[PDB]
A paper describes a structure:
Here we elucidate the structural and molecular determinant(s) of target specificity of histidine vs. lysine in the active site of [name]. On the substrate-binding surface, the residues are diverse, reflecting the fact that the three enzymes act on three very distinct substrates—the large subunit of Rubisco by LSMT, RelA subunit of nuclear factor NFκB by SETD6, and actin by [name]—with limited sequence similarity immediately surrounding the methylation target. To facilitate the methyl transfer reaction, [name] provides a local environment that promotes deprotonation of the target nitrogen N3 of histidine (and concomitant protonation of N1). Most (if not all) SAM-dependent MTases use the classic SN2 reaction mechanism, which requires the target nitrogen be in a deprotonated state.
Second, we incubated [name] with [name] in the presence of a molar excess of SAM (at pH 8.0) and crystallized the post-reactive product complex, i.e., the methylated histidine and SAH. The methyl group at the N3 position of methylhistidine is 3.2 Å away from the sulfur atom of SAH, where the transferable methyl group was attached before the reaction, and makes three weak C–H•••O hydrogen bonds, respectively, with the main chain carbonyl oxygen atoms of Thr252 and Asp274 as well as the hydroxyl oxygen of Tyr312. The methylated imidazole ring is perpendicular to the aromatic ring of Tyr312, and the nitrogen atom N1 is within H-bond distance from the side chain of Asn255. The current configuration of Asn255 appears to serve as a proton acceptor from the protonated N1 (N1–H•••O=C) of methylated H73; and to donate two protons to the main chain carbonyl oxygen atom of Ala268, and to a water molecule (numbered w2). The water (w2), in turn, forms three additional H-bonds with the main chain amide nitrogen atom of Ile270, one of the side chain carboxylate oxygen atoms of Asp274, and the main chain carbonyl oxygen atom of Arg253. This suggests that immediately after methyl transfer, the methylated histidine is positively charged with a protonated N1 (N1-H) and a methylated N3 (N3-CH3) and forms a cation–π interaction with Tyr312. The main difference between the pre-reactive and post-reactive complex structures is that the imidazole ring of methylated His73 rotated away from that of histidine.
Residue numbers in the entry:
A (entry chain A): 19 to 501
B (entry chain Y): 66 to 80
């Protein structure tokens, strides 16, 4: 287990992960190639460089005491290992909705600025990737403090999980379920980026003199980096700075033990007291788990970045890339109409599962995408031109009945085309989830690919319904609603 | 309202 062999592997790994994209048709092979190199490095290393003797629950009392000494709320809840979500907070008393039950002063947080003033400071001021990417800076901040026995944040670090359910921890066959989906490319990117980052910083630590005082200089395993970046991506937060002029990334102890449920964001930052504050999202009776609303993220973002799949996600969505073709003879006019509306000529839009299926920006694009030349002129010339552009994102004011029929006909055909690019059908995915016994990580992948097709299927039906509604208004010569 | 709403686990760019 010579260090020179590991240096040769990280050098091979860095160059492999620094190569350009091999084309979307060879991304799976590249992924497997990178996996093989990573697993060979991981098999030659000793896992996490720092492990703690006690189990996770043994260190929660020290977290409460540590957080109490620095002004945080520690009464009214307890840590419980729930089966569905893992460890979380459970109310020991009745908590009414909108009650301020949880607050964490800034002194407890781990932030980019706390990383600047730590042992990582010297290396931070020289490496561009650390300066430009605060999430990576927080990840190394967490690693350096983890390997420091007398760190101020040890009570928080000793309570963190030792493993996560991000795709970085998935088996090869669990990721294979995602083949031919939209989400698997982000899984590829996450894995390639993490592998490139580890090898890059492994060599940076070994060559920069201002990293010699780091504990990572003596031990920095791939397991360390995967755990660190998984800790940050599943728990990081955006808070304002002390003066309130700039925003920064932060890890918020104690409060980040809350699991996710549907609702509204009830967590903010109070600058007057300089502390994170969280009011109860709903009534929490004693003995009930305390939840918060993480945000309006899709199940793909929850799986890839948060490490879980949320059933009945009201904000689920899929991507759909659309653009005006340069072969279109009306390209110049369409591009100008889109530019005056603040919409690019080509972009990635979203199809939502909750009505409406498309946003105002996507509706405005599809209207211009299907405009005739004479309709485009009325959006470019005259005293009413800007007024017409102002209503492009409004469903109540169409350009014309024919324009609506054409844009909903296109969306139905495109959504039907996207469904035909998946390896399996919706009925096949449901059969797998029903007849096979799967792991949590495998279920996440299969539910993820199922959710994509179900959003596309609902977009197909909603577009067909809208097509028939506006065709009725056109066959009956309905008066066009004016604003 | 919340002057600084905190989205937990906000997605950041790793590229
Ligand atoms: N609704 C939910 N269902 C399942 N797991 C969830 C969840 N909300 C949060 N989690 C889990 O909690 C993580 C965020 S941190 C929340 C506390 C965490 N359970 C812990 O033991 O530290 C996620 O990455 C996921 O592992």
């Amino acid at each position: 287990v010579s260090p020179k062999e590991i240096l040769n592997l990280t050098s091979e790994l860095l160059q492999k992960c620094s190569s350009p994209a091999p084309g979307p048709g060879k991304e799976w092979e590249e992924y497997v190639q990178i996996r093989t190199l990573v697993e060979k490095i991981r098999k030659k290393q000793k896992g996490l460089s720092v492990t703690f003797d006690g189990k996770r629950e043994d260190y929660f009392p020290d977290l409460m005491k540590w957080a109490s000494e620095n002004g945080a709320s520690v009464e009214g809840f307890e840590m419980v290992n729930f089966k569905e979500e893992g460890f979380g907070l459970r109310a020991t008393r009745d908590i009414k909705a909108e009650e301020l039950f949880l607050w964490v002063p800034r002194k407890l947080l781990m932030t980019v600025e706390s990383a600047k003033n730590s042992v990582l400071g010297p290396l931070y001021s020289q490496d561009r990737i650390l300066q430009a990417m605060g999430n990576i800076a927080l990840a190394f901040h967490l690693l350096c403090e983890r390997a420091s026995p007398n760190s101020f944040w040890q009570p928080y670090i000793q309570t963190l999980p030792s493993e996560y359910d991000t795709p970085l921890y998935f088996e090869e066959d669990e990721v294979r379920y995602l083949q031919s989906t939209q989400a698997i490319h982000d899984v590829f990117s996450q894995y390639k980026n993490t592998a490139r980052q580890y090898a890059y910083f492994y060599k940076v630590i070994q060559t920069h003199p201002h990293a010699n005082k780091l504990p990572l200089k003596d031990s920095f395993t791939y397991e360390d980096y995967r755990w660190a970046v998984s800790s940050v991506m599943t728990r990081q937060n955006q808070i304002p700075t002390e003066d309130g002029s700039r925003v920064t990334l932060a890890l918020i102890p104690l409060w980040d033990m809350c699991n996710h449920t549907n609702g509204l964001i009830t967590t903010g930052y109070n600058l007057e007291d300089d502390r994170c504050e969280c009011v109860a999202l709903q009534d929490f009776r004693a003995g009930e788990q305390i939840y918060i609303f993480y945000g309006t993220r899709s199940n793909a973002e929850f799986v890839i970045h948060s490490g879980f799949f949320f059933d009945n996600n009201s904000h689920d969505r899929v991507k759909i890339k659309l653009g005006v073709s340069k072969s279109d003879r009306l390209y110049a006019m369409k591009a100008e109409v889109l530019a005056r509306a603040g919409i690019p000529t080509s972009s990635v839009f979203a199809l939502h599962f909750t009505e409406p299926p498309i946003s105002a920006q996507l509706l405005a694009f599809l209207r211009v995408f299907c405009m005739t030349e004479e309709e485009l002129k009325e959006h470019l010339l005259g005293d009413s031109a800007i007024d017409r552009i102002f209503t492009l994102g409004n469903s109540e004011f169409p350009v014309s009945w024919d324009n609506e029929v054409k844009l909903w006909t296109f969306l139905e055909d495109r959504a039907s085309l996207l469904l035909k690019t998946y390896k399996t059908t919706i009925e096949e995915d449901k059969s797998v989830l029903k007849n096979h016994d799967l792991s949590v990580r495998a279920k996440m992948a299969i539910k993820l690919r199922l959710g994509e097709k179900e959003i596309l299927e609902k977009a197909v039906k909603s577009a067909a319904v809208n097509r028939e509604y506006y065709r009725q208004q056109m066959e009956e010569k309905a008066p066009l609603p004016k604003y | 309202t919340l002057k600084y709403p905190i989205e937990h686990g906000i997605v950041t760019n790793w590229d």
